[model samples]
Target: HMPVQPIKLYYLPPSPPCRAVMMTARVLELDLHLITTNIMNGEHMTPEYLKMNPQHTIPTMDDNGFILWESRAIQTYLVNAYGKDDSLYPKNPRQRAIIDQRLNFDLGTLYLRYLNLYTPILFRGEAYDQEKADKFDEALGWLNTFLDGRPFVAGENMTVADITIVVTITNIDAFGYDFSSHENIAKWFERTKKMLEPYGYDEIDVTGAKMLASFL
Candidate 1:
């Protein structure tokens, strides 16, 4: 029999990317051994973790001896290596292309806009960047348009694309951006949350907003 050892995930709770990876693992019913690296304490930049991933990013994975970094890359690896079929990550070229597009949006657009708006509010005690937040609003508006008629991002069936987008949008939700305004997006978010209910993925505290308010 093949080894059934639990996969190890190194993560920090504050990271949306890390949450995305964790959500994927749970959806696949994979046994994940979570290793917490305290980013607030700078554990991720330590020499030891840097050896595991020179990029020094959270949400790294250790599958036995196979080490991987980058949240989306880790997700692709997990589904390919562990999943029985191409459901989470489809084998079809067209479907894979859709997933790729979503990943690109998550990393390129969503993450960048989120960091610009939220980081200053969180770390610098500065006024939240309303300009950046407005841009983020535009980006999400486009996403809602994309999801207008579809049940999910890629299609009717839920896929890794949905997971990626949902996790990324969670940052906006944390900032008190009302998903309720975008009916389709809010419906999608609620649907995804219900889907992950059995995986111990519950709504957690929004320390980002709490910290920002305190600073203000």
Candidate 2:
């Protein structure tokens, strides 16, 4: 109901998980202090950083003394703890459950498959694997199905799930991964972009996606 101090975030721009948290913060109109922790140089592996989050993941959030990691968890916690309303996360069991399901799908299947398909290619000097590509496409197919008749992934409203999933889509699109066959997602992608345009879609998310694509 009331505003607090700016939340401290340790993140990298090109990363989808970090972008999800940044986008959520922008949507909430919360003050954010972004600390760019480049994982490439082993910055996140430092002892000081490891104590806050042993995983040493990017996008570690320090909201006052409560330190947290995992983008989806941080996203939901921001809404629950700081948001004035339940519009982003919602209070109703069914609606919130649907959002949770979509978030899980994004974390487990959609984003994981993307990592599996592209990590070796992007990080290591390896060529793309056709089998991994097919699995990634299958993940996109499920996302398309979820958005079949709805404007957003979870439902009609633009929840945090949309923010999280769209960041993954941004990463996919940045790599020139064609999701043209999924007409539903294509339309929803544009719709979601418009919805987030006023909320740092261009400056934060797109810029990060472009930076990540530069490595390809």
Candidate 3:
């Protein structure tokens, strides 16, 4: 059930982006040789790692000789490079465009607000700011609006967008955020969790997120 040489993924388990890529790999059935990279110890700042990713981010993927970073980008690349079917990321222009939009939304708005709210608290031991917390909830409101009539983030089908954004949502959940007030998002979260369960959502994303939350 294993390959001779699996893709190398440099990651920290509790990181949301790292968990995102790990979950995507599971969905694609891609064999990934997980490498624990401790950024806390400056492991990511080494010249060797900098040569591969100047940003020095966790969850860098090495597919043979190829190198990549950015969790969303890596997920799409995995689907394009090795997926037997395009179900995770269809080639249809409109469908793919919507999926791309959701990914950008997660990166720019949803996840951005989350980081803004939590980074200071998690890293500096600062008390939670109500304003920052409100902004994060505002972003979740948009996600609930987007899921108004649909079961998935990008529409009917679960695309890479779902995999990317769900990680953020699950992390928020782990952080003790109350998104249950958003009816659509509440339903979608449970539905997405069930859909991803077969692909190691509980073992990977859930476990990793809880680990991060434990630090709080």
Candidate 4:
């Protein structure tokens, strides 16, 4: 089925959260009118966008008249509202519960720590912070272990969990850390990329990743 209404996104391409939302859109084959909201230029701080999203996060979405922000929430909404089948996001309660847990981990533990860990370097040109780096390694450990005896994040088949988690993990690699220890994740990353590449995975998630890689 095709979308019957307009869909638009306010996003910055290199942002991990924005890429996560874009990945979900690609999975759904959504046609989006992208409005690049350069937070750096304070574009998203405009009165109109702030009126629609008080938090003013990038990757804000408008599906017809419905406005939404927060990349994870936007992905959940897209799956629920437009998905042709629940395979990408199962309708089963137990299945959905695990996916929800992973998404929360992504938001609170993973992405939160990522911002804490990397933003200083990206903006202030500060040296890498050790404590936050430790937390990020711990986060990756949890993700790697979670993949044990399971081919996908939520087990059996891929889910929204994989989409969000993979994007967050990919962001960590921008710092050029060695991941030989995370064997499962290393393999999973390759496999997931193989699976998603046909859906514009590289274009959205990997292509512009190093746009700011020269940061301190």
Candidate with top lDDT is: 2
Which scores greater on lDDT, model 1 or model 4?
A: 4
Residue-level lDDT tens digits of model 1 in 51-72:
9889988888988888898888
Poorest stretch of ten by lDDT in candidate 2? 1-10
Per-residue lDDT of 30-139 in model 4, one digit per residue for the tens? 87888898977888888998898988888899888889988888888888888888888888999999999999998989788888888899888787899988998898
Q: If both were scored by lDDT, which would come out higher, candidate 1 or candidate 3?
A: 3
What's the lDDT for residue 202 in model 1?
62
Off by over 4 Å in 1: 1-4, 203-216
lDDT of each: 0.76, 0.90, 0.89, 0.83
**Per-residue alpha-carbon lDDT of model 3 for 144-202, expressed as tens digits?**
99999999998898888998899888888888878888999899889989989999999
Candidate 2: lDDT of 128?
90
The predicted structure with the larger lDDT, 1 or 2, is: 2
Task: In angstroms, give how far residue 84 of model 3 lies from its true place.
Answer: 1.0
Q: Can you give the lDDT of residue 154 in candidate 3?
A: 88
Best-to-worst order by lDDT is 2, 3, 4, 1
Which portions of model 4 miss their true places by more than 4 Å? none
Best by TM-score: 2
